[PDB]
Design a protein around this nucleic acid. Sequence first.
RNA 1: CUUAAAGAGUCAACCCUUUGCUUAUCUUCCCUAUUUAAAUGUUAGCAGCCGCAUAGGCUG
Lengths: 166, 248, 152, 285
Amino acid sequence: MYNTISITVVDADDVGVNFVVSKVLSTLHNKGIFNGEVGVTFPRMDKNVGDIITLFSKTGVDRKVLTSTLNTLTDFIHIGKPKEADKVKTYRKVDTKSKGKLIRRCIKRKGVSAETAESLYGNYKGEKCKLPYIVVNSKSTGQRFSMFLEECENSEKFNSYGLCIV
Amino acid sequence: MRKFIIVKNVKVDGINAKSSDITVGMPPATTFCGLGETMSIKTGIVVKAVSYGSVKFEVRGSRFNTSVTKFAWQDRGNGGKANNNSPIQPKPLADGVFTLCFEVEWEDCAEVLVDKVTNFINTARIAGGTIASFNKPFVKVAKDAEELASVKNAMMPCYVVVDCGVEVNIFEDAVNRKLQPMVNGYKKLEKIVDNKHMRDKFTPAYLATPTYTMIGYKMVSNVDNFDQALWQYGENTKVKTIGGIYND
Amino acid sequence: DLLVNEFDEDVDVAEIADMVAGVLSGEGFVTLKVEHYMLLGEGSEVFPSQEFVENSKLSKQLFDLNGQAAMHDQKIGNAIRTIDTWYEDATTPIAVEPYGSVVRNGVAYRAGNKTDLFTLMDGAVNGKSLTEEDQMFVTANLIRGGVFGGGK
Amino acid sequence: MTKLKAPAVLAYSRKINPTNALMFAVNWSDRDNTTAVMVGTKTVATVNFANLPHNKNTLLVKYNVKFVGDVFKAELGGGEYSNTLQTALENTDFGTLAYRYVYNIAAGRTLWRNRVGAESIETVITVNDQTFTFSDLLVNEFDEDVDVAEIADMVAGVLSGEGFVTLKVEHYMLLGEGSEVFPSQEFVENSKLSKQLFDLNGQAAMHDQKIGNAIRTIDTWYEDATTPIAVEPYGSVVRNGVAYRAGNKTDLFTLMDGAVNGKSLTEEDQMFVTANLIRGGVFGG
RNA sequence: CUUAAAGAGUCAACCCUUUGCUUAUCUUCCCUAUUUAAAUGUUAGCAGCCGCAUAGGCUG
């Protein structure tokens, strides 16, 4: 089995649920949690995650360090008791890069140069790389990606928020 | 409750624009009621009433004279004459774009109704004109007279036909009331004896002559009572609107 | 670019004629959406359908739909059904006509020579035997449509 | 000899008048070296941003709120209807209204997105040469504070009578260097075109009506109540696509017409109607 | 069960010469634009790595 504990966002309609949810997941990642042995799951996700953010682990979530790392947002937050269940819809983030990014790698590496080479690869762009399930956070580099959460089955290896491979 | 199906932008090319010997132009309400009844026969859907509106329309020819269509030889015993232009009756044609709305009895799901309606339209004409293209038909429904206004404005934009009755007669009403005559039905002149030459061997046959009313065109929106613009068959082998004569 | 007066063999014409003959031989329908592109040159005269009107204001009136040049549906029709290469002394395909009529030129290639639609139809109905191309001509007249009058 | 309707242009002037809010950056232990938060323009395909500088860690929001009395004297309404409604509401609990207004001011609800994620929050209020400090108050409940009641006493004296009084408000929020600050949002025609943030001489700011919607959030007397909503004649919260006082005879106009035409009002209804008259608007036609 | 059912308008074309729009002119008096307000759409996206790259995967 795992070890699950749920943080539910409540009384944040002043400031919007999803904004809080993103702030919470951010503060989690920014310092401490998700040391490779925690991951995240949203049991009420439909569009734009939802009202519940559960954390799971096989080595017991520290219910008390949560309440002091979420101390900046504790007024919009209800942390639940450690309950348990065997089964956790696991998610992973989906990247879609713009074409200008693609072209810089294709100039610096992937052998090419000048505009004529932009037009070679710049032939047809993503046309419509739409995506679903956002959570927003500004990374340490200095940009604001729009994380996309796709359901994958259990990888049992996570880095920061979501799944990985081995 | 009350279900309607709307088909917008029915581009039709080649309409038989002669509705009678003294009316050439917009096909009359008898034509669209006959279309609705043809669909009723071909699909099984019960068609309560129909409302039609012109989006574009043009009679072929000039301003005061309609175009001729070139008659092709067609009858037996004319081989000694098929080397010359065939003699020629008048048959003004027109081209247009209409929006249709049928009130229907439907209990099932909308997709089935829409697909049956499309599969019928693909086999039909309108006043003899080839149907070139139509939008995807869509269903709406109304309980009170508030949703009826939404069904009405769903046809936008188009000019629908309202019946404002006859005061004196066709010609005086055209001159004085500045309205437009329209074939609204028929008057039976004599029963036809032998069905040797008819579309049926059994259906009752009559020589007839058209009966008219005085109509007006109005933007489905500006019409208040949508019933005043829904045409159906009825009394005395005429056709008329659900809401009677137009004056709100 | 395709040769018009010869029905030369082409795999795509045949691939569409598959579905067209399937619909004609049975029931249903099939709609082809046709575009034509012609490289004529900047400012070249195009030829819309000409109107048959008694209009004293114009000596030649071109067919228009809200001011745009167009061609009558019936003229496109007369073009399509030009397939008759089976009249006597056949040269070029003519339009399917019960009398092989080309009033355009003042001749009828099926007048009074036992090969008109009515002679051949009376033959077919009254037990006589039909060539493959006489069958094709009669059925193409049926595809044309018509109100054939005279008789009893 | 019987009925009494309301004038066609019965209107009341707003009585809670907040100024616009300006946004500065300070350090939590260096509140005298203020620096202005500038609105940010940089391009994509072009939208606005507003950040704290990389050498200051506390957002400072300054504004003022003036409370104006004579809350029953209409702006365009006539005499009889408005005066009899004034008589029917003279026993309204003004103490509670003043307390909730001043608390929403002190608890910092007016900060909206700027209070989310704050290490600590401190409100500094000046009024009648008296300075009050509030620290880390709770927003979602009207907690009991002696200073909030002390200021709401003056506010209720103004509202229930004549004159005015000005609360000069500062807010300090510990957010961290380079943090995103949240001014008011301007108009956007379509999603792809330019986004814009509200400023004043280039300095980030918040609309006065937003602070007003915050201070006005006191209505807890709507059916199946829960959190406090803003005072609207129909209790409309368009963000939730509902109006918690629509079509259930708990609206402002029904209760007003009742109070004028003999019927009685609860203390909750009286507080609601007087909060509406303090909000302002046209209640006629 | 549609005034149902049916139909090739087609060839060709020099619109040409010339021209004074002239004189004169008072647009005047009066004016309350007002109450009120959450831009929402959490914004919605992308910067770097591996890559034969518009296969897939990974970094805060």
